[PDB]
Amino acid sequence: LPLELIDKCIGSNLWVIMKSEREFAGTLVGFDDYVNIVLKDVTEYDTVTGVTEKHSEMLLNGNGMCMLIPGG
Amino acid sequence: LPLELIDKCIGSNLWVIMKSEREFAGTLVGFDDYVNIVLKDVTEYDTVTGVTEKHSEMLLNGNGMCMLIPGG
Amino acid sequence: MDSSPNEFLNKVIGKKVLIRLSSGVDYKGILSCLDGYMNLALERTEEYVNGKKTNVYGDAFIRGNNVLYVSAL
Amino acid sequence: MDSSPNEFLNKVIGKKVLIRLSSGVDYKGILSCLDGYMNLALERTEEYVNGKKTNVYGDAFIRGNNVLYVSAL
Amino acid sequence: QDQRIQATFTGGRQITGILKGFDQLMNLVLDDVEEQLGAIRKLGLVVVRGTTLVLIAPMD
Amino acid sequence: QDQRIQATFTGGRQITGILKGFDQLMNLVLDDVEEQLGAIRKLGLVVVRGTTLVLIAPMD
């Protein structure tokens, strides 16, 4: 089950790939039925420009995400 | 009410504007709660390339639509 | 509101349909079945980018919620 | 699953947040309230395209379901 | 309500119009709509989809 | 199921992987995933979102 796998990842580092050219890596805090997720200590990666940004904590919207990858 | 206005348009011509650079004009047949709509005798307009295409009938997905305009 | 979308898809089961993505990719295939959520099972499907056939699928599943449109052929 | 998203938004009510769109537009503003659907009421909001402040809003409504992310500032 | 508002869409599209109604899903009815293309197009009476609606704010 | 499949996403992204599970909303679990970028990247175990999933088909 997709959502059971995601649930196993709480407190651990997650790698997220958007349909746009952006990736996020952070610590999964929790998520809702729609897989809107909350991440802590996040690195945002712009995969075209190469630009990186840090975030203490964020609600990452699930609509534009392609993949969530346990690990980083 | 948005959905009551759309309901008034059934059997009549509707103009639809997508978030992408595309427009549709056709006869509204019906729609669901999510405003996925069915159109008849449709003209598809690519607003960049200027290319036009005809359709006898189509299910036009509501997720990418910005606006529905009663008339054409 | 009603179930006009599902009625339309049922009406075209067993026929060829054109499925467009907002990206501009087109699929032409035979609609075999659907569920109530507009998930589509396709047979004998051709994929076109820029008018060039780019692939074929004997069977494909297509998530109707994520396409631009399904058009009767 | 739980209500971690709504918990996060409640935790940051009255604070400045960064709201990014997939287009690359950024909003920085004060979160006043939200509803259960992640519709957001903002105050004192600045809009940035390509790092240039492009507009300000004393009050704006923002549809949280349609943004890329809301980040604590 | 009955106020002129501006709206932006997930695609980047921007419009302006008078709010006449709305629903739980954030579909709106706007009158006298104008889309900023520095040109503009008048669109009249429109239904705005909450599915692509990002921002709603008073005029300016 | 346990078959290798290919998948395409609303963004244009394309991947390949072994189907291990899925749910009513069309989220999938895939193992041994590879994204076609003519290069490729190996991604291992992934959860695919039904929210951007367009196409699923057998290998080839």
Author numbering:
A (entry chain A), B (entry chain A): 6 to 77
C (entry chain B), D (entry chain B): 1 to 73
E (entry chain C), F (entry chain C): 32 to 68, 78 to 100
Q: How do the authors describe this structure?
A:
Sm and Sm-like (Lsm) proteins have been found in all three kingdoms of life: bacteria, archaea and eukaryotes. They are essential parts of ribonucleoprotein (RNP) complexes and are actively involved in various steps of RNA metabolism including pre-mRNA splicing, mRNA degradation, telomere replication, histone formation and translational control. Members of this protein family are characterized by two closely spaced, conserved Sm motifs 1 and 2, which adopt a conserved Sm fold that consists of an N-terminal α helix followed by a twisted five-stranded β sheet. A common characteristic of Sm/Lsm proteins is their tendency to form a hepta- or hexameric ring structure.
